[PDB]
Amino acid sequence: GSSGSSGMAEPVQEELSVLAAIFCRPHEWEVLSRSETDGTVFRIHTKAEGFMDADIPLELVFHLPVNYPSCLPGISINSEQLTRAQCVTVKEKLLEQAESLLSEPMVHELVLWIQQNLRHILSQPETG
């Protein structure tokens, strides 16, 4: 067991642990710094089915503030392949979606979401 009793949060906790199962990898699942109330910040690397049966390196950094879910999580998209604009586009979407996924665990979904709707989001020709 553990020393004492630490219950930072019921949902926030389960949502964090439950995730350690999907990845269950020390390389795929990495948490920079996590606190009880001060907040919880972790950066996990994920890979999608690319566009041609290939795996593209994606950087999804989800942050759980003290207001959350009240407040939206801090997402940061960054790919060594994609450009500075593309990465920005991917995020914009994630954030927009998160809104509707408020008061709910959007850290797990957002992932399985972009992993599939990757080529879709990337295919967004803007006027200008």
Side-chain angles (χ1 to χ4, degrees):
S2 276
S3 166
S5 199
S6 57
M8 47 90 66
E10 266 80 53
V12 189
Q13 178 162 274
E14 88 176 76
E15 188 60 35
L16 283 163
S17 180
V18 71
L19 284 164
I22 286 90
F23 301 96
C24 81
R25 283 272 89 84
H27 320 153
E28 312 275 301
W29 173 257
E30 180 86 292
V31 41
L32 321 189
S33 280
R34 57 90 210 171
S35 324
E36 294 302 75
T37 183
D38 282 291
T40 312
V41 183
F42 59 77
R43 179 271 205 162
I44 76 86
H45 205 261
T46 183
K47 308 173 78 77
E49 203 163 282
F51 325 140
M52 39 206 106
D53 274 35
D55 328 313
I56 297 296
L58 276 170
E59 208 196 283
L60 272 150
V61 169
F62 293 116
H63 153 220
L64 328 178
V66 309
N67 271 72
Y68 156 110
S70 200
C71 190
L72 302 157
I75 296 153
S76 182
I77 306 312
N78 320 269
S79 168
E80 183 187 84
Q81 281 208 15
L82 308 166
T83 49
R84 187 82 83 73
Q86 286 312 314
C87 74
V88 163
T89 298
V90 180
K91 171 206 151 273
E92 294 273 286
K93 303 293 182 285
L94 273 86
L95 279 286
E96 275 289 276
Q97 271 272 100
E99 271 190 270
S100 273
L101 284 153
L102 270 159
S103 188
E104 270 163 58
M106 58 270 259
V107 184
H108 189 199
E109 274 315 88
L110 287 163
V111 185
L112 293 87
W113 180 78
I114 178 62
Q115 273 35 90
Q116 275 188 20
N117 302 285
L118 174 79
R119 63 162 155 199
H120 185 243
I121 300 160
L122 283 175
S123 204
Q124 284 284 68
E126 75 279 312
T127 307

